[PDB]
C-alpha cells in the first residue's frame, strides 16, 4: 500500500516518484493542496509534523523527508528494479564514496539549485521578476559545485561510481527544472557534466515525472 | 592512520571526535586555522574542495562532511566500541526510523541550533550583541522540533530506538553549547528531552570534547 503524499511540481516529491518508478513500484500520488494550507493542518501534521511534502506510506510504515524515503525504497526493494545502491555492498570504499556524495548534493547542490529554480520558474508564474543579483550570486556557487562534479565524472561514469545510484538520482528533479532556464549553460559548458546530465534525465523513470 | 582536519571549537568537528572516542579509536586532530583562511586555500582544498572543516583521513581513505564520516566510522568499525547503529541490522523498520531521524536533525535541528549558538556564544566573543529578535525567532522553531522529540522519547528511550545511535550523537555538539545559554530552558521544560539530554551529554566520549 504505497501512497505518496505531496505536490507533483515539488522537487522533493518528484525525487520520490522517480525512485518509485526506478523500482517499477506501484503507488498512488495523494495530492496535498499547499495553496489551501493543507500541509499545515491535521491530519497531515500526523504524517509530517514539520508540515512539508513529501510524506510516504508503505502500508503501515510511514515516512517523510524525501531522501529518507528513497533510501528506504533502495533497501526495502533492493532485489527489484534498478539497484540504486553500490554494486558491491561489502566494499566500504564504495560506501564512503556514496555517503559523501549524498551529503554533498544535499548541502552544496540542493540549496543552490532550489533558490535558482524558484527565482526563475516559480516567481515568473506569479508575474514576479527574477532578482538578477541573487541569480548570478547563486550561479557562482553552482559552478563551483559543478567543477567538483566535473572532476568526479572524469574518473567515474557517475557521481558515486561506475553505476547509477541514489546520489545521481537526488539531483534529477532540480536539474530538470534548471534545464529549461539559462542556468543550463553551466551544465553544458562542462563536457562530463553535460554528458552525465543527458544520461540521468533521459531515463524513462525520469521522463515520467516532468 | 586517522587524522581529523578541523577546528576543536567547531560543532561539525566535535561531532566527528565523539564518534571516534565512542569507537575507542586513536586519531590526531590536525588543526586548521580558519582565521588565517587556511581552509580556503591549497592543500586543504584537496581535502575538501568546498573549503570547510572537518576533513578526515583513515589512512588512504579521505572524506569530509561530518555525518558522512560518522557513518563511515559506524560501519567501518562496527565490531568495535559502542554500536552506533541499529541493534537488529535486518530490521527494515529500524532502518527507516533512523534514516528519518538523521534527515530530521540535519534539516530541522542543526540549522536552528547553529544560528542560536552563533548569536549567543560566538558573537559575544567579539563583543557583539545577540540579535534578540533572531534569537526568539529561532527559539520558536527549536521548541517545535523539541515537541516532536518529546513525542518520540515517550515511546523510545532514544530518538531512533531503545539504543544510542548516530541519530542522538549528531545533536550532542549543538546541545552542549546551547546548554550554557538561556536556550537550555527549552530542553529542561520538557521531561523526556531533559532526561535524554542529560544522558547523551554525560557520556565520557561526549565529555572529552568540551
UniProtKB/Swiss-Prot annotation, chains A, B:
Binds auxin, endogenous flavonoids and the phytoalexin camalexin and may be involved in regulating the binding and transport of small bioactive natural products and defense-related compounds during plant stress. Binds a series of heterocyclic compounds, including lumichrome, harmane, norharmane and indole-3-aldehyde. In vitro, possesses glutathione S-transferase activity toward 1-chloro-2,4-dinitrobenzene (CDNB) and benzyl isothiocyanate (BITC). It comes from Arabidopsis thaliana (Mouse-ear cress). This is Glutathione S-transferase F2. The gene is GSTF2. It is an enzyme of class 2 (transferase). Keywords: Auxin signaling pathway, Cytoplasm, Detoxification, Endoplasmic reticulum, Microsome, Oxidoreductase, Peroxidase, Plant defense, Stress response, Transferase. InterPro entries: Glutathione-S-Trfase_C-like, Glutathione-S-Trfase_C_sf, Glutathione_S-Trfase_N, GST_C, GST_Phi_C, Thioredoxin-like_sf. Residues 1-81 form the GST N-terminal domain. Gene3D superfamilies: 1.20.1050.10, Glutaredoxin. Homodimer. The keyword Endoplasmic reticulum applies. The keyword Oxidoreductase applies. Residues 91-210 form the GST C-terminal domain. Its EC number is 2.5.1.18. It is found in: Cytoplasm, Cytosol; Microsome; Endoplasmic reticulum. Expressed in the root-shoot transition zone and root tips. It comes from the Eukaryota. Pfam families: GST_C (PF00043), GST_N (PF02798).
